[PDB]
Amino acid sequence: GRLMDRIRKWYYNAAGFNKYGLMRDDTLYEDDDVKEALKRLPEDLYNERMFRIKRALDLSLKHRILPKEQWVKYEEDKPYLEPYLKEVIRERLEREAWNKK
Amino acid sequence: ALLRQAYSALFRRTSTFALTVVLGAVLFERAFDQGADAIFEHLNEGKLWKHIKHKYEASEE
Amino acid sequence: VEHKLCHSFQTFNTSYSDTGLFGFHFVADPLSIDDMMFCAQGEWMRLCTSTTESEVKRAKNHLRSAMVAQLDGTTPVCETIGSHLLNYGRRISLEEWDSRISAVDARMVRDVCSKYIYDKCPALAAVGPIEQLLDYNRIRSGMYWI
Amino acid sequence: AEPEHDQRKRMGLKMLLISALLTSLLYYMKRHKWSVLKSRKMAYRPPK
Amino acid sequence: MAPNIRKSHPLLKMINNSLIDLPAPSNISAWWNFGSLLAVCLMTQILTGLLLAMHYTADTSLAFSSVAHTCRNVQYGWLIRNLHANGASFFFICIFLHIGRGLYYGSYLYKETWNTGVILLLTLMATAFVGYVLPWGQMSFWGATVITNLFSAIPYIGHTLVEWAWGGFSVDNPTLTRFFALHFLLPFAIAGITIIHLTFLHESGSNNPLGISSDSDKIPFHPYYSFKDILGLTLMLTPFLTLALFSPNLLGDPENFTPANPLVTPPHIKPEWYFLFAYAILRSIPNKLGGVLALAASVLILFLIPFLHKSKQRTMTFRPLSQTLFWLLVANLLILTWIGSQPVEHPFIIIGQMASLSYFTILLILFPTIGTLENKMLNY
Ligand code: HEM
Ligand code: HEM
Ligand SMILES: CO/C=C(/C(=O)OC)c1ccccc1COc1nc2ccc(C)cc2nc1C(F)(F)F
Ligand SMILES: CCCCCCCCO[C@@H]1O[C@H](CO)[C@@H](O)[C@H](O)[C@H]1O
């Protein structure tokens, strides 16, 4: 059935970052893989992300949020960084395994 | 228009602003203290030495 | 020049019928914006508080040569007439201007600049890689104390 | 056990008034400075 | 050379690069106000401590009275004494929120800043511990006796370290004079290490409530945070002073208005509020050594938090499950606190063992687990 889907969309809404207009990926802690992943982003996706973040920080400082209409919707959240991040990790593991044996 | 006058005479030059803060403090102290003690004592009528003092201050033995 | 603060800078006194803009504009590398702004606002405060008779003597001579240079050719003299009538409702000669200019002294410059600059809330426009220039509040505090 | 009793309370009173007065003034000041950021507006204008 | 003497001067450059032009996130909340308060508090404790130390006498026959003399005879000695003892409390209230904030917003990812933070906590705890002995009242003596006696539960090196630390066979004058010296000393080490704390911090810069790069929106520490911090100060200071001047003995144990007596054990030996939670965990494990270890770990556990972070997000702002777990933990601590002030009797004994058990469970098991679970609910 649709259990996992109901849970996921539930959590997504419970989390609330969409209220700041943030995309799930905009909320990733910038560890090393994410740092690299971001460097691989196309200029436009990078600048869009940048504005979204600066926008959230300004809301956060103001102690306000976006008008309900503008909240990112679960099914419209573009996972723009995940493809890159998964590759950066794919490469790192290869190197890691190769430097052992 | 005091705000205007005050701004031109007191708050404009940093030099007069500081000078204002000093005399402001001097005056404020004198006033805040009197008012404070006055409130405190009034709240405690007849309990302080100041009050019952007359009973033994040259009025005994 | 000493600290390589900018590629260029200019002051301007853009007048209008009932209002105007008195300021300055500079172009500089991303990493020297702060110091330039700092030194610039500095010079503005120097204007309101310590201008010397030496500085004015020269300023007047520079301004005289400047007004005369605006009358070098027929087109520029025509422009002056067109604007003078339109803005001052008549023409103001070099002989009159010069009189006005000669009247200016240190004392006067200080008082006039203090009147329009000191402790005022400026208007700011910044374009480009401006990260190093920041906070209106900080710019605002630059508007007081020599 | 505590001879300062009275003075201690007379002070507490002054401490309160000044405390109220100062906390107030500093609250305005803080708000006044932050107003620049609190009201700030921004837009994203790509060459799109 | 540099145009403004704030950038070039080897000293004004320092005051500047850490308190005036220092880039701070535009959105740090009031929970970021505690670092400065902790600092101001520290400078304050030192000042009032020196003032008191100038009228104190480190000797078992004069300690209790020298403090009484200070309150009774020294101009404003009572006030200085009040501020010092209550300042220690303020200090801890501030430090606990400082830590809390850090746990909630994942600041511990700044490992060196975090590990030095832990060392500051321990140093502060030892400092208050020795400082508490100085007035030499009943709780001062028995607290000293009971606690320092736990070390003899260590293997072999135990029974020694104790009589070495005491300078004799029981807590006596030699112990007192060496405690005054340590109490006078440790605060400076705290100041020292605090400098290291802020140095590591400045490498990265402050974290912020959303846990995302604030590089796109940094603001000068001054006037934004200088004004915000000063306001935060006055806000806290009002209750501190209110409680101090209107209810001086609210927090203190009355057993300490009675000169230490080695031949009379007080009915209920308990620490100041800020140590209660740890006392509870200490008493939870009956067996001198295991209780010591449990106490040790109750604080040393902080060195592990950085390693039990499994979330892909830095803060808990967007993690509802972790949030409640977090507040469960906080409430878990009020309970241990409460238990710490209650005698060792049913139902307290069992409630106590539970609260302890839950405390370590939440930090070592649940937190890392729920984080993993949460990553899957985001489809990560
Ligand atoms: C002597 C006591 C302490 C002092 C003087 C102190 C001071 C500071 C100061 C001034 C800040 C910066 C402003 C702020 O975020 O509050 C800071 C940040 C920080 N401190 Fe402390 N601190 C103390 C103890 C500790 C403790 C016990 C911990 C945790 C075990 C700690 C962890 C941190 C961390 C992780 C930050 C990063 C804050 C962030 O940006 O998220 N500090 N501290
Ligand atoms: C981190 C800072 C400090 C803390 C946490 C602190 C804490 C304490 C505590 C809890 C007490 C017992 C208070 C009571 O009577 O109940 C105390 C007392 C005392 N402290 Fe400190 N102290 C600090 C710094 C200092 C310093 C720097 C000195 C010395 C220059 C000092 C000198 C004293 C003295 C003389 C007493 C004994 C008199 C009294 O009991 O009030 N303290 N301190
Ligand atoms: C000299 O003793 C001073 C005590 C005190 O409360 O100081 C403020 C005191 C008084 C009565 C009973 C116990 C204590 C000290 O307690 C502690 N004191 C501690 C001192 C340092 C550290 C790292 C942990 C401590 N833990 C505790 C615990 F409460 F858990 F027993
Ligand atoms: C938040 C800071 C509050 C500071 C309040 C200062 C008021 C203390 O004022 C005190 O009052 C006593 C009683 O009249 C006098 O005896 C003392 O000399 C005087 O210093």
CSV table of C-alpha atoms and ligand atoms in Angstrom, one decimal, chain E residues 42 45-46 49-50 52-53 56 67 81 84-85 88 91 124 127-128 131-132 134-135 180 183-184 187-188 190 272 274, ligand 2:
chain,number,residue,atom,x,y,z
E,42,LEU,CA,33.3,35.3,35.2
E,45,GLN,CA,32.9,36.4,40.2
E,46,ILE,CA,36.6,37.3,40.1
E,49,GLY,CA,36.0,37.1,45.0
E,50,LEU,CA,39.1,39.3,45.3
E,52,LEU,CA,36.1,38.9,49.8
E,53,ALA,CA,39.5,37.3,49.8
E,56,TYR,CA,39.1,36.2,54.7
E,67,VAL,CA,33.2,35.6,56.8
E,81,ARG,CA,29.2,38.3,49.9
E,84,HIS,CA,29.5,36.2,45.0
E,85,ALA,CA,27.4,33.3,46.3
E,88,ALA,CA,28.0,31.3,41.3
E,91,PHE,CA,27.0,31.4,36.5
E,124,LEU,CA,33.9,25.7,37.1
E,127,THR,CA,36.0,25.8,41.5
E,128,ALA,CA,32.6,26.1,43.2
E,131,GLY,CA,34.8,27.7,47.1
E,132,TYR,CA,31.9,26.2,49.1
E,134,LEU,CA,35.6,28.3,52.6
E,135,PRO,CA,33.0,29.6,55.0
E,180,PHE,CA,41.6,28.6,49.4
E,183,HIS,CA,39.8,28.5,44.7
E,184,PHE,CA,41.8,31.6,44.2
E,187,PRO,CA,39.1,31.0,38.1
E,188,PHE,CA,42.2,32.3,36.3
E,190,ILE,CA,38.9,29.4,33.5
E,272,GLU,CA,23.7,23.4,46.0
E,274,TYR,CA,23.5,23.0,40.4
F,2,HEM,C1,34.6,31.0,38.6
F,2,HEM,C2,34.5,31.9,39.8
F,2,HEM,C3,34.2,31.6,41.1
F,2,HEM,C4,33.1,30.8,41.5
F,2,HEM,C5,32.2,29.8,40.8
F,2,HEM,C6,33.1,31.0,43.0
F,2,HEM,C7,32.2,30.4,43.8
F,2,HEM,C8,32.3,30.4,45.2
F,2,HEM,C9,31.4,29.7,46.0
F,2,HEM,C10,30.3,28.8,45.6
F,2,HEM,C11,31.7,30.1,47.2
F,2,HEM,C12,30.9,29.9,48.5
F,2,HEM,C13,29.8,30.9,48.6
F,2,HEM,C14,29.0,30.7,49.9
F,2,HEM,O1,29.4,31.3,50.9
F,2,HEM,O2,28.0,30.0,49.9
F,2,HEM,C15,32.8,31.1,47.2
F,2,HEM,C16,33.3,31.7,48.2
F,2,HEM,C17,34.4,32.4,48.2
F,2,HEM,N1,35.1,32.7,47.1
F,2,HEM,FE1,34.6,32.3,45.2
F,2,HEM,N2,34.1,31.8,43.4
F,2,HEM,C18,34.8,32.2,42.3
F,2,HEM,C19,35.9,33.0,42.2
F,2,HEM,C20,36.6,33.5,43.3
F,2,HEM,C21,37.8,34.3,43.2
F,2,HEM,C22,38.5,34.7,41.9
F,2,HEM,C23,38.2,34.5,44.5
F,2,HEM,C24,39.3,35.1,45.0
F,2,HEM,C25,40.1,36.2,44.3
F,2,HEM,C26,37.1,34.0,45.3
F,2,HEM,C27,37.1,34.1,46.7
F,2,HEM,C28,36.2,33.5,47.5
F,2,HEM,C29,36.2,33.7,48.9
F,2,HEM,C30,37.1,34.6,49.8
F,2,HEM,C31,35.1,33.0,49.4
F,2,HEM,C32,34.7,32.8,50.9
F,2,HEM,C33,33.8,33.8,51.5
F,2,HEM,C34,32.3,33.4,51.2
F,2,HEM,O3,31.9,32.3,51.5
F,2,HEM,O4,31.6,34.3,50.7
F,2,HEM,N3,36.1,33.3,44.6
F,2,HEM,N4,33.2,31.2,45.9
